[PDB]
Amino acid sequence: QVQLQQPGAELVKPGTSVKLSCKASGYNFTSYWINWVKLRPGQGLEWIGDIYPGSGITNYNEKFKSKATLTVDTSSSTAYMQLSSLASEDSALYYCAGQYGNLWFAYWGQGTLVTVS
Amino acid sequence: DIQMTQTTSSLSASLGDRVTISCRASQDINNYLNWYQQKPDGTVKLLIHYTSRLHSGVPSRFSGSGSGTDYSLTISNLEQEDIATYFCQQGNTLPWTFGGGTKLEIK
Numbered sequence: 001q002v003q004l005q006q007p008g009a010e011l012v013k014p015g016t017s018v019k020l021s022c023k024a025s026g027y028n029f030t031s032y033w034i035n036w037v038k039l040r041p042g043q044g045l046e047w048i049g050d051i052y053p054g055s056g057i058t059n060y061n062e063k064f065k066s067k068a069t070l071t072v073d074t075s076s077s078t079a080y081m082q083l084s085s086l087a088s089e090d091s092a093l094y095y096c097a098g099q100y101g102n103l104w105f106a107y108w109g110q111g112t113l114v115t116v117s
Numbered sequence: 118d119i120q121m122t123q124t125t126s127s128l129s130a131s132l133g134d135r136v137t138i139s140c141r142a143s144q145d146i147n148n149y150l151n152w153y154q155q156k157p158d159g160t161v162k163l164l165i166h167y168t169s170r171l172h173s174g175v176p177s178r179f180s181g182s183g184s185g186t187d188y189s190l191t192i193s194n195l196e197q198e199d200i201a202t203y204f205c206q207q208g209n210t211l212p213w214t215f216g217g218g219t220k221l222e223i224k
Contacts, residue, residue: 037215042126045204045215061212095161103172104208105153108161 001026004096004109012086012116020112022079022096029077030054033099036070036081039111040092051079086116119143119207123216129224134195138219140205142186149209150188152181155202155218164203165190195221 003025012018022034036048049060051070058070067090069082079096093111100106120143130136140150148168155161163172165181168188178193192199200223205216 035213042217044217045206047213047215059211063212097161101173103151103163103166104213105151105206106163110159111161 002098002100002107004098004107006094006096006109006112008110009113009115012114014086014088014116016086017082017084018086018114019080019082020094020096020114022081022109024077024079024098027098027100030074033104034070034072034079035097035099035105036068036079037095037097037105038064038092039095043092048081053079083114086114088116090114091116118212119146119210119214121205121207121214121216123203123205123219125219126217127220127222129222130195131224132195132197135191135193136195136221137189137191138203138205139187139189140183140216141188142207145185146207146209148184149207150181150183151206151208152190153204153206153215155204157201 005023030053033050033052035050038046047061048064048068049070051058053072071080093113095109095111097105097108122141150168152165153161154164164175168183169181180191200221202218202220204218207214
């Protein structure tokens with residue numbers, strides 16, 4: 001049923017940029033918020049921001065304001081996150097999670113491990 | 118930001134063992150505490166929400182309690198499938214913040 005699909009890994013070069021994808025499946029993409037979190041092992045889980053696909057409004061952790069840009073493609077039901085000026089500190093696991101049933105992190109993707117060389 | 122701290126980063130135990138994971142907030146979060154589990158295959162699931170409400174399809178051996186800034190998760194009988202990493206999250210105020218996680222292992 002409801003499910004989020006992200007590519008499993010991304011090999012990036014420092015200084016460049018990357019756009020992570022999150023494709024929503026069995027539900028009204030337009031009706032729920034999409035969350036993006038970062039997981040550096042041993043360095044905790046971090047909320048990056050939200051985006052409501054039906055309006056485009058976003059909420060950012062002011063800690064990731066100048067780093068991540070959340071966008072969506074209403075046509076393909078895909079949520080996007082672009083990371084700029086990739087640095088080694090950006091190497092982490094990135095999940096997108098959707099809200100559902102009145103809960104903000106109800107469904108999770110399997111994550112995209114980003115390794116910047 | 119409200120800092121969440123899971124004191125123990127790694128915990129060892131034997132299957133059948135009764136285990137407890139604690140999580141502390143830097144300030145009262147009025148029971149808006151959620152627990153997530155990340156299985157070895159990379160999947161993440163919502164286990165408990167609002168401190169003690171077990172989520173859909175979660176085994177009864179999982180339980181939560183807490184108030185103020187003190188919260189913990191408890192697994193009555195440690196099962197093989199329970200071997201994973203648990204994270205606590207506060208949903209009291211934005212930005213949402215999570216604890217560092219607790220890795221569960223055998224022995």
